[PDB]
Design a protein around this ligand. Structure first.
Ligand SMILES: CCCCCCCCO[C@@H]1O[C@H](CO)[C@@H](O)[C@H](O)[C@H]1O
Ligand SMILES: CCCCCCCCO[C@@H]1O[C@H](CO)[C@@H](O)[C@H](O)[C@H]1O
Ligand SMILES: CCCCCCCCO[C@@H]1O[C@H](CO)[C@@H](O)[C@H](O)[C@H]1O
Ligand SMILES: CCCCCCCCO[C@@H]1O[C@H](CO)[C@@H](O)[C@H](O)[C@H]1O
Ligand SMILES: CCCCCCCCO[C@@H]1O[C@H](CO)[C@@H](O)[C@H](O)[C@H]1O
Ligand SMILES: CCCCCCCCO[C@@H]1O[C@H](CO)[C@@H](O)[C@H](O)[C@H]1O
Ligand SMILES: CCCCCCCCCCCCC
Ligand SMILES: CCCCCCCCCCCCC
Ligand SMILES: [Zn+2]
Ligand SMILES: [Zn+2]
Length: 274
């Protein structure tokens, strides 16, 4: 019924594309007006941190279109289709791996590629849990809330916005750059080519996976990974940080089991309970 309320069990697929009534939603929760560009609305807010984090993770839906972040001529940068990630980055994967395969034992290059993929899944778990869901640990700053929003908050705010799910290359480059330098500073040159190629390939698998978890009836073997990730959205976002798998969830005890609690809804009509 109301999308802002977490559920113990996921509802129907088509209840997740029900457009939010903008006026009602603003008046009811006193948060963001979906009808107006969201970013300045955050930059110039009187939110305190606990309210922002409580509210941004209670999902809404703009409808068939995409909510405005800027509303001006910068708006194209905020829209990135699923196919953008493979076309942008798979050529980089193939170039770095191809280099390694001409200057190094190919069998060890393949092996170092695979450990790149393995390290990616750990990064995937770590970024998601500790950077993306900084949440409670956030300052009392609007610039912090806007940064959070841009990195992951928006996606929790609007799960079914098909153009605000995968990472825009502009942001990806900023995050990837320190990893690229670190790998090429530690590892022997052509080991870095093979290793980085793998980590990068793992990233592409992640975001594509992440996309199709939201916007697709998947083949059966992935169908339960879909339930798992969607529960991270509509049940508990303190758990279920793995999205290509719950491997690292199990390892670090953040698995999202079938009697996991709901997440707290601290605020209502602008005010906190108790
Ligand atoms: C100012 C440069 C344009 C910013 C576009 C804002 C759209 C934010 O896009 C976000 O990218 C994050 C990772 O980068 C992803 O984790 C989120 O799922 C996605 O919402
Ligand atoms: C990796 C190369 C991919 C080739 C392009 C795939 C065809 C794109 O297909 C697009 O999919 C969109 C899904 O959001 C639809 O909204 C568009 O109508 C459709 O044209
Ligand atoms: C590495 C890339 C793996 C992903 C390829 C999956 C291709 C899915 O196929 C696409 O699904 C889209 C759903 O958004 C539809 O809009 C497109 O019409 C369809 O071509
Ligand atoms: C590698 C190039 C693949 C191009 C993918 C085609 C998708 C973009 O083309 C169009 O973009 C429009 C945006 O308004 C969408 O509304 C359409 O559904 C889509 O087909
Ligand atoms: C980052 C891209 C690679 C992901 C690595 C982890 C993928 C694990 O994937 C899982 O493997 C299981 C095997 O027991 C299968 O049962 C599941 O269907 C599959 O989702
Ligand atoms: C790492 C890659 C993860 C994505 C793989 C699963 C994507 C499944 O995507 C599938 O694409 C099909 C072809 O158009 C569509 O018919 C299906 O509706 C869609 O589920
Ligand atoms: C492909 C991921 C982004 C790569 C960023 C490269 C950072 C610069 C590398 C060379 C260092 C110049 C000072
Ligand atoms: C053996 C070292 C592997 C290093 C892999 C680095 C992965 C780069 C992708 C980083 C993505 C940041 C979001
Ligand atoms: Zn998601
Ligand atoms: Zn999340």
């Amino acid at each position: 019924f109301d999308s802002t309320t977490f559920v113990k069990e996921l509802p129907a697929e088509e209840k997740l594309s029900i457009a939010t009534d903008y006026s009602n939603d603003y008046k009811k929760h006193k948060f963001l007006d979906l009808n107006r560009p969201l970013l300045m609305q955050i930059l110039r807010s009187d939110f305190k941190k606990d309210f922002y984090v409580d509210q941004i993770h209670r999902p809404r839906h703009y409808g068939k279109g995409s909510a405005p972040l800027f509303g001006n001529f910068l708006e194209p940068l905020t829209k990135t289709a699923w196919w953008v990630v493979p076309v942008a980055w798979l050529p980089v994967v193939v170039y770095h791996m191809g280099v390694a395969l001409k200057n190094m034992n190919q069998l060890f290059a393949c092996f170092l590629f695979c450990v790149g993929v393995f390290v990616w899944t750990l990064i995937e778990y770590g970024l998601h849990r500790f950077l993306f869901h900084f949440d409670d640990w956030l300052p009392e700053s609007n610039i912090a809330f806007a940064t959070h929003f841009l990195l992951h908050g928006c996606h929790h705010y609007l799960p079914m916005d098909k153009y605000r799910l995968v990472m825009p290359p502009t942001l990806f480059v900023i995050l990837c750059a320190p990893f690229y330098k670190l790998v090429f500073a530690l590892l022997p040159l052509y080991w870095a080519y093979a290793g980085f190629a793998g980590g990068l390939f793992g990233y592409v698998c992640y975001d594509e996976c992440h996309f199709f978890l939201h916007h697709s009836k998947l083949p059966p073997f992935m169908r339960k990974l879909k339930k798992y990730h969607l529960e991270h959205h509509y049940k508990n976002y303190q758990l279920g940080f793995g999205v290509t798998s719950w491997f690292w969830d199990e390892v670090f005890g953040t698995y999202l089991g079938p009697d996991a609690p709901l997440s707290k809804m601290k605020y209502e009509s602008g005010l906190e309970v108790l």
